[PDB]
Write a protein that binds this ligand. Structure first.
Ligand SMILES: *[C@@](C)(CO)[C@](*)(O)[C@H](CC(C)C)NC(=O)[C@H](Cc1ccccc1)NC(=O)[C@H](CC(C)C)NC(=O)[C@H](CCc1ccccc1)NC(=O)CN1CCOCC1
Ligand SMILES: *[C@@](C)(CO)[C@](*)(O)[C@H](CC(C)C)NC(=O)[C@H](Cc1ccccc1)NC(=O)[C@H](CC(C)C)NC(=O)[C@H](CCc1ccccc1)NC(=O)CN1CCOCC1
Ligand SMILES: *[C@@](C)(CO)[C@](*)(O)[C@H](CC(C)C)NC(=O)[C@H](Cc1ccccc1)NC(=O)[C@H](CC(C)C)NC(=O)[C@H](CCc1ccccc1)NC(=O)CN1CCOCC1
Ligand SMILES: [Cl-]
Ligand SMILES: [Mg+2]
Ligand SMILES: [Mg+2]
Ligand SMILES: [Mg+2]
Ligand SMILES: [Mg+2]
Lengths: 125, 222, 222, 212, 196, 233, 204, 195, 195
């Protein structure tokens, strides 16, 4: 198996691969979240250099993780699918063992844990 | 077909007092109708004022004692020479036994010592790790002979105060080390009379705050 | 059981231990394994306790009737023949293993019988679970032309070997000496090397200890 | 063993005997068959003593880890399902367990779950488990109402174990009582059948089959 | 067991070891497996000690009753009585018997009766667990019309080898000589036969 | 799971005042067939230990190889291999006991009963038993197979307890062992007349005696025994 | 399906100074199910007492059989049967069914009316007599009874003291057996008076 | 066959017996009377192996009726129970034993007392205040231990019996199609038609 | 577990499942729901080995719910049944197979048709107008062969179902404590509370 430590510390105490991943997020289309007194709203930018698009079938920017939780993102589109899939699987797994849907904090903590694991695992960015 | 188990006979007995605890066991070792040894000890000082015996299939018994003795050693290494309490030892032994739940150690295990309040403590285990603290326990081949006698003489079961119309029970009290050793010796001489696998010698290990003392007595050799 | 038979100058001696077992439990600590078939023909029995007693009594009964019928003192070979044919008929299901010995007008005799009905002749024999321990002694110390006192010593030593080394045997040594021209002497408890030591404590209860619900006089008279 | 637990107006009653056997040999009369998992959760034990004792203490460790991770006491449903999923992994290996997970939480209220070693998991109001379960059912069912008082409910649980202790040869020793409320579990003493049987016989007038 | 019977010029000789076993324990090291059913008709016993004793006792009874009515029975007649018992009770018997006798008309004769209860008249016969190891030796060394001393040596050397290889055989080598002269018993101890 | 094919019978032994004695016959049985007669079942390790083995002979030869290799391994990087850091009887035993129990625990045993006899560096007598089950025990006298049933009773008449050991000389002890071997030849159907005997003394060291024979046997009384009951000729 | 341990029960007998005691539990069950707490296992024929443990149908059958035989004995002999003689009768009768036996563990107890000597005896299921100076035990808690009797017993106990010893032997033995208990009865037997006492014991 | 119960009260004996006859996966009948009148004041219920039950019951019935005609007299319940026990005690060591368990409820006219005897197929007899055969006992005995009193009336006994049937109908796996109840007292035997 | 039935009519699928959970000689529960909603228009009933049943049902439920979230779309009853069959077909050659039999009732919204699938533990799938598992079929199939028509209403189907339960309650040996009935149609899944 490919083992290389890609995410490593630099002399100044930075992990450049993690910091360069933030630059990819900065390149991505804007996403915004605002929560009211009785609701949350997720807003997302879509760039208009793409005409002749088919909006029926094109992947939507906001994804349902369960019937009560949603996930939007900024950055690499292909990368987001992997996180969304894992989150959706964990959502069903939680319902199965705890007999209760995930809290938003729990689902976030899981997704965040997956992201962290990819910062100190060999062979992955 | 190969049978991985055997029966080495013998019997063991643990009693707890106020500030002490005894763990006794006969020294005879057998297979079928033959005597292997007239003096083969099976009650061991394991350190930290814990005495232990694992009676039944001797090979499993020795293996277990060996593993627990080793567990005590590593407990010191990993936790700054901390004394392993009798309750902690008991829980540790449960995991040793249950670890082989699907290929069990064929033994009745008893340990004795002092609890963390200085009071006498006896714990007993089944072959797969269930345990319980008691004032009193007999184990092994003659357990069924000795145990009911202990219920009657240690825990005063079925004994009522004379003249009270069987209404007031005989009150529970701690026994002196002298009285306890009398009961142990009588228990084993009785067991030796009526059980063929019991005899030759009796070895008692007494546990106080001062340490672990030993006493030996002859038993009938037939 | 351990049982033996030894021939000497002017007759034959047989011996036996006195332990009766029930699995690993000693049922009888002083049972009689030496049986009288006729006044001067005696039997030592190992195996199923009821079978040895029943088969010895039946043949003993028929031997008495035969002796009265023929106006003759019974012969050992007659008891041997009647026992073996009875046991053979039952194909080993009657678990009687016997050492038959005695004196008669023909002389002194020593035989053994097995459950399936086979008989053996010898100057020294041993049967039972402790027969190997006993035979080891007999093979070590036996010689031709033994005296009465030497044969008793050898026989009892062979039983002792069983008592100490075989878990199936224990307690005391019974002996029967059958000499030519003399009455047979049955030596019940010839050796008692397994006396129970004084108990450490009297377990005499204070009167009233046991709780009672009802009392009543029982009528045994008519 | 005989163990029961039932739901009622004032919470949950849990009652167990204290006998342990190896065939016909009575091995112990003082076994603790209720396991205190936390101040709001109880577990009952029937079947193999090592299996029950080992895996229900293990269950308590898993429940502690839940409240450390989630900053919240585990639900009765989730606790029972940890145990049932565990024994299901060992299905066929020969584990022997009949357990009842009893407790109170805010979202659920008083709840009882039956969990056994062939993987059965059932929510319910009344269960009796063990070799003497039928004897306990007979008394419990015929006297059960939802509107029982705390005092009467405690007695019925005690009386049902006594019934089984008497008739079932593999049940006896003493009765251990527990009451589970919104505030947690409360221990209601060890009651030796030696004294309890005669006390109940005299005061209640029952057990006329026995020589008084 | 290792047993054999061998005809020769003057009659017949029977031979046997003296070992009786229960598993690997030797219950009797001085057994007599050569037994008299009539004055000059003897048999070698192998298999169950109980069965062979019971059979021999019945045969002895039959031949004693035969003699009372019809005079001395032939060796063939004795073998027939053994056969009748062994054949008709084949399901309940474990007995391998060699019958050997001396007539004055027929001289020495040997009949062997295996487990099934069949009868086989032979110049010499071998049987018992230890016989397997000496088929080769006995076939190569047997000659008809041997002398007494030659036949004694043949049996002694044969059973010596059978004893050496078979754990179920041992002790002394007993022999019984059947001739017109009478009946002679011979015994040979380990110290002699082991170093042959 | 195994079954033993070529087998060895009893191994007997005892302690005496200055050391230990051990003996075993030279037979390799193949069921009832007494197949091999030149089999040595006593294997010396160094000059202070003898391992006596009964049971399966293929497994015995495997154990021989292990002990042989143990001596080689102990010599590696060990300047005191023939002095303070030489192999003790207790080290050799504990190694075998560990192996025996591990093999039974894997349901693939070495089908043997083993007695390790020797003298420790401080002069103490060593005598301990181990078998296919991993069962271990020690006693003034030890024996395997039929020896346990017939030899032990005879040897225990000499040394019945611990206090009898100082009172027992090497002459008396060897006499008892040689007598026991005779009794086993009378009574064990899978025994041979030829045997080996080994003495390990704290003063005179290891003495290994080969090609011994059972002698002074009583067989003469056999001539008087006729029939099985009623027979007179 | 082990005939001797389907129903359960125990019997014990002891000797004292010019007296004998015989005691039994009252349980009759069907494996785990307790059925009856009034099932007495001790019977008497004149002054000879017989206790029987084991399969309950055979207990009943044998009682009826020995009542039958002792009644005919008394009519022909014109005297009550003695313990030594009755012991032989029990042994003969059991061995008659050698290859189809009654699944029982009988115990004889009584005082010989001529000599005044205390007598006890025990049997296995096929009739082997077990005589004893001290005590005889029988039933599903026989191991327990052996242990209790061997420690508690001393010779030449007075009737009142002997009662305490035998009662404690039975009670504590019964409490360690699942199939024994549910009440108990003790018979104290002197030369010409017999006292019968029911013991208070735990009912589980 | 399956469920047979019995309760002895102050002045009568009450027998309850299930109505179902099942073979395989089919309930062939739901009105079966699992009892026979042995004499005017003696009733026997039965349960066990198919065929054996009725064959045994009718055989006993014939023998008791024969006795009654011969002596012009009714045997006591105790005497009848002893006869039945002996027949089963013989049977258990036969080539093919009767696999039948019975309850015998009777009123002894000489003693003026009700009597209930429980006898299993081995020939194990006991007199009881209340009895059951098969798995029924595992529920009813503990229930009756609690609610039973020795001085109860026939009506109190029927209510006590209703309590048993309700418990069995709640916790028993099989549908036994209710029970036929019969009362035995000083006036003989009668059937309760509405239960 | 024991009794699970299914009837497909004109516009709906009706599933009936017994309420009893029995272990040994004790009915532990009489209100057990032996079904799981896989999707809004698909329902699965189940019966078989203890533990296996619920474990399998919930495992399938989790997988179908996962699919629904991923694709934002409901699988057709036919597609769900094929997925379930394959899982059981894998299982039967495993170290320890799922001993579970299932019925899958669904309403296909694209076809506007009700669908009933019967699948056993071996992975044997069939589409049927009416189905049953276990011993139930031995009574209900012949009954439905006679009384069933393809154009029946939901109400007619419930009456037809009552006829089945009545027959089972009459002839089945065990007390299964009635049934929970659920209907699957164009509007989804609902439970009949009074049956
Ligand atoms: C030595 C001690 C051992 O070989 C001797 O050989 C003695 C012989 C003397 C006493 C004549 N043997 C015994 O003591 C003998 C050992 C034994 C046990 C079982 C089978 C064969 C031999 N013990 C007995 O025979 C006892 C006698 C009692 C103590 C009075 N009997 C039993 O143990 C009976 C065996 C009966 C039996 C039935 C069918 C075939 C063979 C034997 N067993 C029981 O009593 C066990 N059980 C108790 C509960 O009730 C059911 C029976
Ligand atoms: C009622 C009282 C009876 O069913 C309850 O169900 C209790 C539950 C309480 C104690 C938690 N159950 C038991 O008492 C239980 C019954 C049982 C026995 C065996 C298997 C399953 C269920 N008893 C035990 O678990 C005992 C408890 C001991 C005596 C303290 N343990 C044993 O019987 C052990 C271990 C059995 C075992 C299980 C799995 C693998 C291997 C072994 N067995 C022994 O100690 C064997 N034997 C005892 C007699 O002495 C010789 C050795
Ligand atoms: C050689 C040894 C083999 O061919 C000889 O044939 C001799 C013949 C002489 C003695 C006439 N045969 C034996 O020694 C014979 C070997 C034998 C064993 C079993 C079946 C057939 C042949 N040994 C015996 O017959 C002994 C004699 C006793 C010890 C005095 N009897 C037994 O070994 C009995 C036999 C039971 C039997 C089995 C099958 C058919 C008939 C009888 N067996 C036992 O006692 C069993 N024993 C119990 C203890 O555990 C070890 C086995
Ligand atoms: Cl012979
Ligand atoms: Mg002893
Ligand atoms: Mg009980
Ligand atoms: Mg040989
Ligand atoms: Mg009890």
């Amino acid at each position: 198996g490919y083992d290389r430590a890609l995410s490593i510390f630099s002399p100044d105490g930075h992990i450049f691969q993690v910091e360069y991943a933030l630059e990819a997020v900065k390149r991505g289309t804007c996403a915004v979240g605002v929560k009211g007194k009785n609701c949350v709203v997720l807003g997302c930018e879509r760039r208009s250099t793409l005409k002749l698009q088919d909006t029926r079938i094109t992947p939507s920017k906001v994804s349902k993780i369960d019937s009560h939780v949603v996930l939007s993102f900024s950055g690499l589109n292909a990368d987001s699918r992997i996180l969304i899939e894992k989150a959706r699987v964990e959502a069903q797994s939680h319902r199965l063992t705890l007999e209760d849907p995930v809290t938003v904090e729990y689902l976030t903590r899981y997704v965040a844990g997956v992201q962290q694991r990819y910062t100190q695992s060999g062979g992955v960015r | 077909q190969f049978n991985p188990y055997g029966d080495n006979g013998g019997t063991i007995l643990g009693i707890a007092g106020e500030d002490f605890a005894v763990l006794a066991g006969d020294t005879r070792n057998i297979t079928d109708y033959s005597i292997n040894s007239r003096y083969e000890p099976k009650v061991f000082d394991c350190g930290d004022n814990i005495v232990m015996s694992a009676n039944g299939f001797a090979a499993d018994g020795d293996a277990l004692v060996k593993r627990f003795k080793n567990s005590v050693k590593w407990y010191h290494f990993d936790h700054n020479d901390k004394k392993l309490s009798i309750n902690s030892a008991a829980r540790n032994i449960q995991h040793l036994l249950y670890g082989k739940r699907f290929f069990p150690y064929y033994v009745h295990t008893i340990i004795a010592g002092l609890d963390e309040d200085g009071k006498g403590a006896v714990y007993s285990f089944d072959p797969v790790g269930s345990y319980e603290r008691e004032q009193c326990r007999a184990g092994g081949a003659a357990a069924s002979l000795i145990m009911p006698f202990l219920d009657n003489q240690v825990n005063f079961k079925n004994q009522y105060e004379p003249g009270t119309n069987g209404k007031v029970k005989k009150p529970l009290k701690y026994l002196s080390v002298e009285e306890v050793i009398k009961l142990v010796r009588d228990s084993f001489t009785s067991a030796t009379e009526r059980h063929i696998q019991v005899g030759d010698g009796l070895e008692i290990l007494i546990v106080t705050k001062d340490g672990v003392r030993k006493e030996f007595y002859e038993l009938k050799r037939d | 059981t351990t049982i033996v038979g030894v021939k000497f100058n002017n007759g034959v001696v047989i011996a036996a231990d006195t332990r009766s077992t029930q699995g690993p439990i000693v049922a009888d600590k002083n049972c009689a394994k030496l049986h009288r078939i006729s006044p001067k023909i005696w039997c030592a029995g190992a195996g199923t306790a009821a079978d040895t007693e029943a088969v010895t009594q039946l043949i003993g009964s028929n031997i008495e009737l035969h002796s009265l019928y023929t106006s003759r003192e019974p012969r050992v070979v007659s008891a041997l023949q009647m026992l073996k044919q009875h046991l053979f008929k039952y194909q080993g299901h009657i678990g009687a293993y016997l050492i038959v010995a005695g004196v008669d007008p023909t002389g002194s005799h020593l035989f053994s019988i097995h459950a399936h009905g086979s008989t053996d002749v010898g100057y020294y024999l041993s049967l039972g679970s402790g027969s190997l321990a006993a035979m080891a002694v007999l093979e070590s110390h036996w010689k031709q032309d033994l005296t009465k006192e030497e044969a008793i010593k050898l026989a009892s030593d062979a039983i002792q070997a069983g008592i100490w080394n075989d878990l199936g045997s224990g307690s005391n040594v019974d002996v029967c000496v059958m000499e030519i021209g003399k009455d047979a002497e049955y030596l019940r408890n010839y050796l008692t090397p397994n006396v129970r030591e004084e108990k450490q404590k009297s377990y005499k209860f204070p009167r009233g200890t046991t709780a009672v619900l009802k009392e009543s006089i029982v009528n045994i008279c008519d | 063993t005989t163990t029961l637990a039932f739901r009622f107006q004032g919470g949950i009653i849990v009652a167990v005997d204290s006998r342990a056997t190896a065939g016909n040999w009575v091995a112990s009369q003082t076994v603790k068959k209720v396991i205190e998992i936390n101040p709001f959760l109880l577990g009952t034990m029937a079947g193999g003593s090592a299996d029950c004792q080992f895996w229900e203490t293990w269950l308590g460790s898993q429940c502690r880890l839940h409240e450390l991770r989630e900053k919240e006491r585990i639900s009765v449903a989730a606790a029972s399902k940890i145990l049932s999923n565990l024994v299901y992994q060992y299905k066929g290996a020969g584990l022997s367990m009949g357990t009842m997970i009893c407790g109170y939480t805010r979202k659920e209220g008083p709840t009882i779950y039956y969990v056994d070693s062939d993987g059965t998991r059932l929510k319910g109001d009344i269960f009796c488990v063990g070799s003497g379960q039928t004897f306990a059912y007979g008394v419990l069912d015929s006297n059960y109402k939802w509107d029982l008082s705390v005092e009467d409910a405690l007695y019925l649980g005690k009386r049902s174990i006594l019934a089984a202790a008497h008739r079932d040869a593999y049940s006896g020793g003493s009765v251990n009582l527990y009451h589970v409320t919104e505030d947690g579990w409360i221990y209601h003493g060890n009651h030796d059948v030696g004294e309890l049987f005669w006390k109940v016989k005299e005061e209640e007038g029952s057990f006329n089959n026995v020589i008084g | 067991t290792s047993i054999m019977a061998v005809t020769f010029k003057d009659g017949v000789i029977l031979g046997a070891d003296s070992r009786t076993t229960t598993g690997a324990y030797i219950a009797n090291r001085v057994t007599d497996k050569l037994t008299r059913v009539h004055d000059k008709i003897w048999c070698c016993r192998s298999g169950s000690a109980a069965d062979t004793q019971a059979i021999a006792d019945i045969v002895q009874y039959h031949l004693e009753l035969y003699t009372s009515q019809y005079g001395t029975p032939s060796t063939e007649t004795a073998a027939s009585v053994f056969k009748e018992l062994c054949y008709e009770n084949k399901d309940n018997l474990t007995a391998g018997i060699i019958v050997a006798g001396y007539d004055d008309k027929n001289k020495g004769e040997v009949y062997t009766i295996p487990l099934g209860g069949s009868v086989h008249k032979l110049p010499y016969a071998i049987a018992g667990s230890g016989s397997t190891f000496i088929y080769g030796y006995c076939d190569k060394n047997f000659r008809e019309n041997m002398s007494k001393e030659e036949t004694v040596d043949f049996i002694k050397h044969s059973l010596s080898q059978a004893i050496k290889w078979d754990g179920s055989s041992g002790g002394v080598i007993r022999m019984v000589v059947l001739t017109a002269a009478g009946v002679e018993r011979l015994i040979f101890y380990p110290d002699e036969y082991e170093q042959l | 799971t195994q079954q033993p094919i070529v087998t060895g019978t009893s191994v007997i032994s005892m302690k005496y005042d200055n050391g230990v004695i051990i003996a075993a016959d030279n037979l390799g049985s193949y069921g009832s067939l007494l197949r091999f007669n030149g089999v040595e079942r006593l294997i010396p390790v160094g000059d202070n230990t003898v391992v006596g083995i009964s049971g399966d002979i293929s497994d015995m030869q495997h154990i021989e190889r292990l002990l042989k290799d143990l001596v080689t391994e102990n010599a590696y990087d060990n300047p005191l291999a023939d002095a303070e850091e030489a192999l003790e009887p207790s080290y050799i035993f504990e190694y075998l006991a560990t192996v025996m129990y591990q093999r039974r625990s894997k349901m693939n045993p070495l089908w043997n009963a083993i007695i390790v006899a020797g003298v420790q560096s401080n002069g103490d007598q060593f005598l301990r038993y181990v078998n296919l089950l991993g069962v271990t025990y020690s006693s003034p006298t030890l024996a395997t197979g039929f020896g346990a049933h017939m030899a032990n009773p005879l040897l225990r008449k000499v040394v019945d307890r611990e206090s009898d050991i100082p009172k027992t000389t090497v002459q008396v002890a060897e006499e008892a062992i040689v007598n026991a071997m005779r009794v086993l030849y009378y009574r064990d159907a899978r025994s041979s007349r030829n045997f080996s005997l080994a003495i390990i003394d704290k003063n005179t060291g290891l003495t290994f005696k080969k090609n011994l024979q059972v002698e002074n046997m009583k067989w003469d009384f056999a001539k008087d025994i006729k029939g099985y009951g009623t027979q007179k000729i | 399906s082990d005939p001797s341990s389907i129903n359960g029960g125990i019997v014990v007998a002891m000797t004292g100074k010019d007296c004998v005691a015989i005691a039994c539990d009252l349980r009759l069950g069907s494996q785990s199910l307790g059925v009856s707490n009034k099932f007495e296992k001790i019977f008497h024929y004149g002054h000879v007492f017989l206790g029987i443990t084991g399969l309950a149908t055979d207990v009943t059958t044998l009682n009826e059989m020995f009542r039958y035989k002792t009644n005919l004995y008394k009519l022909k002999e014109e005297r009550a049967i003695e313990p030594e003689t009755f012991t032989q009768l029990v042994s003969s009768s059991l061995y008659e069914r050698r290859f189809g036996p009654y699944f029982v563990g009988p115990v004889v107890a009584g005082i010989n009316s001529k000599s005044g000597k205390p007598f006890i005896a025990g049997f296995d299921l096929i009739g082997c007599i077990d005589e004893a100076k001290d005590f005889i035990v029988s039933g599903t808690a026989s191991d327990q009874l052996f242990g209790m009797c061997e420690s508690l017993y001393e010779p030449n106990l007075e009737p009142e003291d002997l009662f305490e010893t035998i009662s404690q032997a039975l009670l504590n033995a019964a409490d360690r057996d699942a199939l024994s208990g549910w009440g108990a009865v003790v018979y104290i037997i002197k030369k010409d008076e017999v006292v019968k006492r029911y013991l208070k014991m735990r009912q589980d | 066959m399956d469920i047979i119960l019995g309760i002895r009260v102050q002045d009568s004996v009450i027998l309850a017996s299930s109505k179902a006859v099942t073979r395989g996966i089919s309930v062939l009948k739901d009105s079966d009377d699992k009892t026979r009148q042995l004499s005017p004041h003696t009733l026997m219920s039965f349960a066990g192996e198919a065929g054996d039950t009725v064959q045994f019951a009718e055989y006993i019935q014939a023998n008791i009726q024969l006795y009654s005609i011969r002596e012009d007299y009714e045997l006591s319940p105790q005497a009848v129970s002893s006869f039945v026990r002996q027949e089963l005690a013989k049977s258990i060591r036969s080539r093919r034993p009767y696999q039948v368990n019975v309850l015998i409820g009777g009123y002894d006219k000489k003693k003026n007392k009700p009597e209930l005897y429980q006898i299993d197929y081995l020939g194990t007899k006991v007199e009881l205040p209340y009895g059951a055969h098969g798995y029924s006992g595992f529920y009813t005995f503990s229930l009756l231990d609690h609610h039973y009193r020795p001085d109860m009336t026939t009506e109190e006994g029927l209510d006590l019996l209703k309590l048993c049937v309700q418990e069995l109908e709640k916790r028993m796996p099989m549908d036994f199609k209710g029970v036929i109840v019969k009362i035995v007292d000083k006036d003989g035997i009668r059937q309760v038609d509405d239960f």
